[PDB]
Amino acid sequence: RDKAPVQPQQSPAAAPGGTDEKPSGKERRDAGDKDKEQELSEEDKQLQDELYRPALEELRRQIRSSTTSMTSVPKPLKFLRPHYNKRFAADIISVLAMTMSGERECLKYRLVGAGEVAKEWQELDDAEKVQREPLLTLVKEIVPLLMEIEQVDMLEKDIDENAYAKVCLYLTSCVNYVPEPENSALLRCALGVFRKFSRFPEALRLALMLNDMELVEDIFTSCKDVVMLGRHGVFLELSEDVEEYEDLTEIMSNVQLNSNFLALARELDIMEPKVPDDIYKTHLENNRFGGSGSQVDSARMNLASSFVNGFVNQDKLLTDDGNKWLYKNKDHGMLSAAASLGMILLWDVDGGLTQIDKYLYSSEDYIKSGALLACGIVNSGVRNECDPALALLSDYVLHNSNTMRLGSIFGLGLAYAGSNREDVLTLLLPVMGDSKSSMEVAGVTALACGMIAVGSCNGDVTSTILQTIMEKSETELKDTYARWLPLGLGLNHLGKGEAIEAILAALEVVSEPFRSFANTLVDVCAYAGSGNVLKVQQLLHICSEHFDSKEKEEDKDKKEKKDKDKKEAPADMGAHQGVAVLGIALIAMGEEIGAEMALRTFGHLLRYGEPTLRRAVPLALALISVSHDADPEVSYNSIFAARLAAMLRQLAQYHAKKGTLTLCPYHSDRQLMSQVAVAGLLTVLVSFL
Amino acid sequence: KQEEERSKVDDLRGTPMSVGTLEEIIDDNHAIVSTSVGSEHYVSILSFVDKDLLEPGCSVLLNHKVHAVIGVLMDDTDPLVTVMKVEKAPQETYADIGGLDNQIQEIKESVELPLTHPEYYEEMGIKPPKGVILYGPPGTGKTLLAKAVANQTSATFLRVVGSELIQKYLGDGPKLVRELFRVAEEHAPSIVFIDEIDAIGTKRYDSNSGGEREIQRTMLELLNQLDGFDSRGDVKVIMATNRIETLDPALIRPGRIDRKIEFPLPDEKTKKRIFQIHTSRMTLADDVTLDDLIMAKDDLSGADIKAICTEAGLMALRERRMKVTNEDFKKSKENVLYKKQEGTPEGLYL
Amino acid sequence: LLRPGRIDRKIEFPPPNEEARLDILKIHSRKMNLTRGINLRKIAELMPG
Amino acid sequence: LREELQLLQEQGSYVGEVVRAMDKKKVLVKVHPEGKFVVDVDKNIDIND
Ligand SMILES: Nc1ncnc2c1ncn2[C@@H]1O[C@H](COP(=O)(O)OP(=O)(O)OP(=O)(O)O)[C@@H](O)[C@H]1O
């Protein structure tokens, strides 16, 4: 109506006119007022006046909350102690106390650091449990553990809304935007409410980030309480890191409750449904044994073509294709072909012995050393291929069993990884104490002990890798040592959450850019990824460094950091000129589903002249798609038609047809511009099922 | 140094440089060069840029005074290159499923799937559809579906209005057909979209020569260049009209245009999603029933759904009401639909 | 063009009524030299619109 | 002020119609009713301008 009766009610300071006006203004507070609160300029004089003065606080927060205020708006309601499903409740509780209580929680969350914001905060928690709208009020009360008692305060009836909605948007935004330490308040109290809940692998996804030993026992007594079975065995083994199946096989070696969780959750039972059904439901033709195998002989692409035929796995046909395929082969290709049989055989435990046994103890060093390498390839749950090589290892400079140390130490690193498995490392102390001029001794030393040493309890600066730091800095020769030792150093930095090991090695190690390149390697491997832009812009700065190899790994950190918010992962790295930078983005595509902008970048990145970078494109190109697929293949056939070009051709023919086990060996493959001895270590990159 | 010899080549270049078309390679490095008006001395070439980049009869960089061949051309850019080459994948793959749902699958598996996955044709020996017309009542979704496949793309998308090709200069239209298909060729497998070519038939214009014998020549160049020779390969071309009558059947015949896809006005099952999602972002007193609006109007477009679903908020928010009564839907649909031929004049139907 | 999503508002103009014809009769009758004792509703009544 | 008027005798730099520039500090000028002419730039204006 007209304000002529009701506007002069503010002018007397009499108590009864206020104490019946404020219930009448409460009645007309269903629409707020007739308008946008033109009473404001005449009632801020009434700020100085004090019986029913909390109702005057309701008036004051109503009009100050009605126009604008960041701190004086919730100040009456923290004096009011709120007193006295409605549209009025949609006004003064929902939106007015949503933004008002939200700026009180934000302004006091950034200002002081009381309990009034705890009581009003739980009042808004309960009030939004009355209003029952999630996916907003939740992300407002994240800032305001508090969120822990919020989750057990709210998770009674609605399961999938808070789990799927709140855990989806808050998990994705918590790895995307929120920093690390509140995330554990995610990881523990989501441990709590999913303890009350079914659909167990979300807890196992909690096991993807926690790396905790209690949840796997709880999910095994619970996932035995809910009796498919071998399926959660399979993604149990694919989901776990390297530590918790040895800790799991001891804490389940004690009790075991059926002794079938021992058979599932180490090895030997993830692959037993697969490989026979891999033979059954699929049928591969002989025309890639022959047709892709008809790529002409130069004893180099016959080597790599035998490697592609090694990756055909309608049986293990390439295992028994007679002789003289390996007789035409050379030394590290004899490592490639002696270990080629195990790459056909990532199963068949008893059959691996009776297939490799012909090539065991043979007349050639690379047949037997690549044969024990294949014994490291075939399985991960035997520990009976330890003793034919493990006793031989000691050579003291340059003998046969060092090359078997090339094959078996990494292969046992392929086979086992404890919490910290140590007898192999006490074998490794005369391995690094050997320090053979062959690179791959210290190569598979650091990489193998890193495969034991990834997923550690925030890493460790133990005397194993500290020993290879000091004995690394002993001799400054063959800078691949200065490259492939911080490989395994950074592998032992994995398992970090908060590692100040970058500062510890930043005190110990740093020097001339061999060891400052070690500094940038630890800078890579200890900083896996979160909402952590401050070192990303540092990533912007030290990108402009004059030393062009720390650029390679330092910018190669991208696909590890931003693997989830992948929209930012297209950048201008092709638009830069430091030609290895195009290699860096050319790494940063990856092996995933292979979207359209990826191959759109592979149009230009497909066409380049240097055979190192042109050799760097087909690996990730055909790797991200494991005609449509063969159209870039015959396109590379049009690119060339040196032997590097035919070798990248066999590389694409190979690759065509945060789990740690797929994260290492391409980062091991980052020093390709070198001997076929390094290409003997090319046949180790096991990351596929 | 190379800056010195490069500056020497730059000093072979006389700062007023011209752009002129070749006619023919005169093989001994002195050539003969047409301008736009063609004053063609026996000029030579600056022999550090590659002469063997260009076919004979291709434009180069020349001089004014000696007319000597100086450099290589780059491109041709008109006001259309800005518009033909769509810069970004703009927006709106779909804001609402439930629009058509029928020819969505048809444009998907007809256009997208042979493009995105061209390996099925190996299995069967099928050629891809080259020309598909999208036509029907105005404002059905056809332009919106063009912006859908523009956003949900995999190719260098091209957006063309059919009336862009209308000039007064002789041959200018077919020239922009040549630059047009040059754009359609040289990026990647691109999605060309051409709209409103039903307005090229019974059309006569101001900035024009003799009308019946101007656009006959340009559309003739479209008939030759579009789906004559110059091996299609993988070049997607989609055109769209509203009517069909002015169409010369010489392009309608197969080979050239393969699929002709009509568009109906939507049924009530699909209406509820458009009514609902057009009302998905408004405060509404949900006690009212949309099914009167979904049932009543029989031949609505989605712009009728849009216009009613905005208009009722104009009637409630006309009086500052956040939520909408049913009578604002009554005034809304009676405000949108006008001249309802029911009674009065004849209304023989009763 | 005649799709409503192309032109939203579509307003016919009828002949104005004797109220409105009377009001415009006040408007353009206002600036004249006037004689007192006149009925304009008769004249707007005589209008067909 | 009156002696300034010899500046009038320099006939005016006519309007040029640039589509866009390219590299090597040169542009693409399409003269009013004439063809395309790549020329070099002055110094008081930039390639970025
Ligand atoms: N979800 C939907 N279901 C059905 N029809 C829809 C839906 N969304 C939009 N539409 C209709 O499709 C049209 C989309 O815009 P459109 O490009 O057809 O307008 P236009 O530019 O006038 O088209 P034209 O120029 O071909 O007449 C709208 O007019 C609308 O009526």
Side-chain angles (χ1 to χ4, degrees), chain A residues 543-602:
Chain A
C543 182
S544 65
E545 183 63 28
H546 189 274
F547 184 71
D548 294 331
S549 179
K550 65 172 68 178
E551 290 180 352
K552 293 174 69 174
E553 297 294 324
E554 196 273 330
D555 295 328
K556 191 263 180 187
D557 202 10
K558 182 183 287 185
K559 70 186 291 187
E560 182 178 359
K561 291 190 264 76
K562 57 176 73 173
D563 52 353
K564 189 172 182 182
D565 51 348
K566 73 277 191 186
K567 193 261 184 181
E568 195 175 2
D572 291 334
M573 298 302 169
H576 291 89
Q577 284 71 239
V579 59
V581 171
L582 282 75
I584 291 163
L586 189 58
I587 302 151
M589 272 70 259
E591 67 177 2
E592 290 295 326
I593 201 68
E596 68 191 10
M597 291 179 183
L599 191 146
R600 184 180 61 85
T601 54
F602 283 121

Side-chain angles (χ1 to χ4, degrees), chain A residues 123-141:
Chain A
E123 179 64 31
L124 186 63
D125 192 5
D126 197 6
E128 294 298 326
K129 285 174 69 176
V130 173
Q131 294 300 110
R132 296 177 66 250
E133 285 92 11
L135 100 112
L136 202 31
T137 69
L138 296 174
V139 77
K140 186 174 264 79
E141 69 194 359

Side-chain angles (χ1 to χ4, degrees), chain A residues 7-27:
Chain A
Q7 185 176 0
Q9 300 297 319
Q10 59 184 349
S11 178
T19 62
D20 64 356
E21 192 272 331
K22 293 186 285 286
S24 179
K26 183 175 67 65
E27 182 182 0

